[PDB]
């Protein structure tokens, strides 16, 4: 968790929308087992990709306003923002290797 940005509905418009560079946003909730499984993978990705990527998390139960802005249907959903715009999307479970493939194709 040392490299994960904790987002809220109150901070999203600053920390994501006013940021240049790439930010991987994980939309999650505590009831979601696959979300909890990807959590340690995100710590590893945040470290390996530091300096070309920031990793952030938004809990959709605590912060219900953001996900509908992007039409999110279910979780996990990962949105890769580049300079305030969604540039890539991945839904559902992902292994480390699958997440690295997704990031490498988009960074
Ligand atoms: Cu950490
Ligand atoms: Cu490292």
Author numbering: 1 to 107
Lines from the paper:
Thioredoxins (TRX) are small globular proteins of about 100–110 residues, which are conserved in all living organisms. Two TRX forms were described in Escherichia coli, Trx1 and Trx22. The former, called EcTRX throughout this work, is a widely used experimental model for investigating the molecular basis of protein stability, folding and function.
In the crystal structure of wild-type EcTRX, two small cavities of 70 and 50 Å2 of internal area are localized near Leu94, which coalesce in a larger cavity of 183 Å2 in the L94A mutant structure. We determined in this work the three-dimensional structure of three full-length variants in which the point mutations occur in the CTH (E101G, N106A and L107A), and one additional variant (L94A) where a substitution is located in the loop connecting β5-strand and CTH, using X-ray diffraction. The four EcTRX mutants were crystallized in the oxidized form, and numerous protein-metal interactions were observed as a result of the Cu(II)-salt added for crystallization, as it was previously observed for the wild-type variant. Notably, the four variants crystallized in different crystal systems, comprising monoclinic, triclinic, orthorhombic and trigonal space groups, for L94A, E101G, N106A and L107A respectively. We found that global stability of the variants is progressively altered from 8.1 (wild-type), 7.8 (N106A), 7.4 (L94A), 7.2 (E101G) to 5.8 kcal mol−1 (L107A). Previous results of our group showed that the specific activity measured by using the non-natural substrate DiFTC-insulin is 80, 95, 100, 108 and 175% for L94A, L107A, wild-type, N106A and E101G, respectively. For variant L94A, the drop was a 1:1 mix of protein (10 mg/ml) and reservoir solution (100 mM sodium acetate, 4 mM CuSO4, 18% ethanol, pH 4.6).
